[PDB]
Amino acid sequence: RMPALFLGHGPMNVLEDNLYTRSWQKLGMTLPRPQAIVVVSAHWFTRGTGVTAMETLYDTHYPAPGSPALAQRLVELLAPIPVTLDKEAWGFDHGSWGVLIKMYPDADIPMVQLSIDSSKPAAWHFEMGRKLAALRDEGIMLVASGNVVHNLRTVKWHGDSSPYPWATSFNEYVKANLTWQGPVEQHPLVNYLDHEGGTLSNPTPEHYLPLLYVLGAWDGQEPITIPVEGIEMGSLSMLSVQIG
Amino acid sequence: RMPALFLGHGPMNVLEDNLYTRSWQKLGMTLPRPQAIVVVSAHWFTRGTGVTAMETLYDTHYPAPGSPALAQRLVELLAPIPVTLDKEAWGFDHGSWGVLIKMYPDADIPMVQLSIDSSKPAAWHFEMGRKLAALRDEGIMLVASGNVVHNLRTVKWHGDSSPYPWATSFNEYVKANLTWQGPVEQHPLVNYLDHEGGTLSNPTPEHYLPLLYVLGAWDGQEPITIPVEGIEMGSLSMLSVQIG
Ligand SMILES: [Zn+2]
Ligand SMILES: [Zn+2]
Ligand SMILES: [Zn+2]
Ligand SMILES: [Zn+2]
Ligand SMILES: [Zn+2]
């Protein structure tokens, strides 16, 4: 049974870097090797849900082989959710590419990209991870990447380095509610904009929503882990989450 | 009379970095301060020409004030070229943001973004810089950013560090033809795919085309300078060009 992973993304490198990259490389050594991976990124935020099997914007290159079989299986599992199927791969954002180059350096794990539907509310994205859960017993690792705090208008690129108190506030409300159980509509992490708090940490939903894909996939029983965490440049949250 | 600048973009930082960043900061200290700037990036590659006056994807933030006056003046100058006018700013690619944060750290120069028309041939993009030339006598600096060699399938992110010979070959054909004069249709840098050479260095045109915007703006008389140059990771060319 494969784990699902939400990674806070960014180290702005690298090669021989930091705590985060060593946590990614990390889980790539330590976690059960997947038959294939469904990648969810903050940066594939589209009207409607798209899927690529990667049979062919960003100053990056991650030549993982595609899995047309997993793509079709994704489309079927999601039906009647209408899915658009791209032939070509989508470019990987620097952050996602940064997680993947550290995690599985050799780009030898077959892969599908899944996009996040803009037009849908948080509860729906949580329901998505509920549907993706079945794939975890079929040798498939879910890797979602984004940032539970993500306001680049508040980011302090040089000085000083302490976490803004509102950043730590929202982040702790995230961590304290990972294991919440009950109706989806009443989930604190689904109703995240109910926090002070919420809109300032996430003025648009895309960097936060990927966590819900991972949380949607939790059975209520298996452990939930935090392989690495951190708030960089005052408001970039680096909170990573392991399900199972 | 304002200079036009093509910058090869990437240092993957920074703050206290390298030769390239110090060349950018650099020209920002040394060049005549502009009333406003038209930014052209490799990464705004669209069907049709777009313009933003910046009255409102990338893990970046460059809060330069817009210039609606320059935007309208751009639309008028280009007519009958059909232009789409966005209210909102487009996100800056890391490379462009990297050039601008070093060049004009304070983000206090008014600014317009101009996009590159996908559907048009190299000669047309050269003609674009011919039209943009007039704005140089109106206090306006053209800043184009991309990379005259740009194949991320050949990039050696770690080892070793020597420039591929084909990379140096195409690059030198670029440099040897900056000052070429004659009919546009017969310009070596317009007919760049005529080199061995060309398609391998530039499998799609977007990172190269921005130079033509700058070269289009040369009168035949003023100096053409190379403020910095370099080939990193075997095939990322860092060749920068100053017109006037
Ligand atoms: Zn680029
Ligand atoms: Zn980037
Ligand atoms: Zn954000
Ligand atoms: Zn991001
Ligand atoms: Zn390229």
Q: Which amino acid is at A121?
A: P
Query: Between chains, do A61 and B93 touch, taking CB under 8 Å as contact?
Result: no
- The C-alpha atoms of residue A226 and residue A203 are separated, in whole angstroms, by 24
Question: Measured between alpha carbons, how far is A25 from B147 in angstroms, rounded to an integer?
Answer: 31
Give Cα A62 distance to the centre of its chain: 17
What is the rounded distance in angstroms from the CA atom of residue B178 to the CA atom of residue B217?
12
DSSP output for chain B: ---EEEEE------SS--HHHHHHHHHHHHSPPPSEEEEEEEEEEESSEEEE------S----PPB-HHHHHHHHHHHTTS-EEEESSPPPPPHHHHHHHHHHSTT--S-EEEEEEETTS-HHHHHHHHHHHGGGGGGTEEEEEEE-SS--TTS--SSS--PPPHHHHHHHHHHHTTTT--S-GGG-TTTSGGGSTTHHHH-SSSTTTHHHHHHHHT--SSS-EE-S---EETTTEE---EEE-
Work out the burial of residue A78: count CB atoms within 10 Å of its CB; fewer than 13 is exposed, 13-18 middle, 19 or more buried. middle
Measure the CA–CA gap between B42 and B212, rounded to whole angstroms: 12
Chain center to CA of B39: 8
Alpha-carbon distance of B114 to B99, in angstroms, equals: 16
Structure tokens of A7? 């990674």
Euclidean distance between CA atoms A203 and A208, whole angstroms: 10
- Residue type at position B148: V
What ranges do the domains of chain B cover? 1-244
Report the alpha-carbon distance of residue B103 to residue B31 in Å, rounded. 10
CB A7 within 8 A of CB A144: yes
List the resolution, Å.
Answer: 2.3
Q: Which of A15, A101, A152 sits opposite B61 (nearest CB)?
A: A152
Q: Using the beta-carbon criterion (under 8 Å), do A12 and B15 form an inter-chain contact?
A: no
Instruction: Tell the residue number behind the tokens 């095939």, with chain if given.
Output: B235
- Pairs across A and B, CB distance < 8 A: 33
Which tokens sit at A148? 């539970």
Q: Is A108 helix (H, G, I), strand (E, B) or coil?
A: coil
Encoded amino acid at A133, one letter:
A
Contact B229, B141 (CB under 8 A): no
Tell whether residue A61 is among the known ligand binding residues: no
Any idea what the Cα angle at residue A26 is, between residues A20 and A29, rounded to 5°? 160
End-to-end CA distance of chain A: 8
Which of A10, A12, A155 is nearest residue B61 as measured by Cβ atoms? A155
Query: What is the signed CA dihedral for B9, B12, B17, B23, rounded to 10 degrees?
Result: 0
The CATH number that domain B1-244 falls under is 3.40.830.10
Q: Is A207 annotated as a binding residue?
A: yes
- Helix-then-strand count for chain A, H and E: 7, 10
> How was it solved?
X-ray
State which amino acid sits at residue A30: T
Q: Chain B closest CA to A154's CA: distance in Å?
A: 10
Write out chain A residues lying below 8 Å of B152, CB-based: 59-61
* Interstrand relation of B36-46 and B140-146 (parallel, antiparallel or unpaired): parallel
Compute chain A's Rg from CA coordinates. Answer: 17
- The values of phi and psi at residue B132, to 5°, are -65, -20
Distance B61 CA to ligand 2 centre (A): 12
Contact B235, B149 (CB under 8 A): yes
Cα B21 to Cα A71, A101, B218: the distances in Å are 42, 26, 25
CA angle B168, B172, B173 (to 5 degrees): 120
Q: Which amino acid is at B183?
A: P
**3-state secondary structure at position A22:** helix
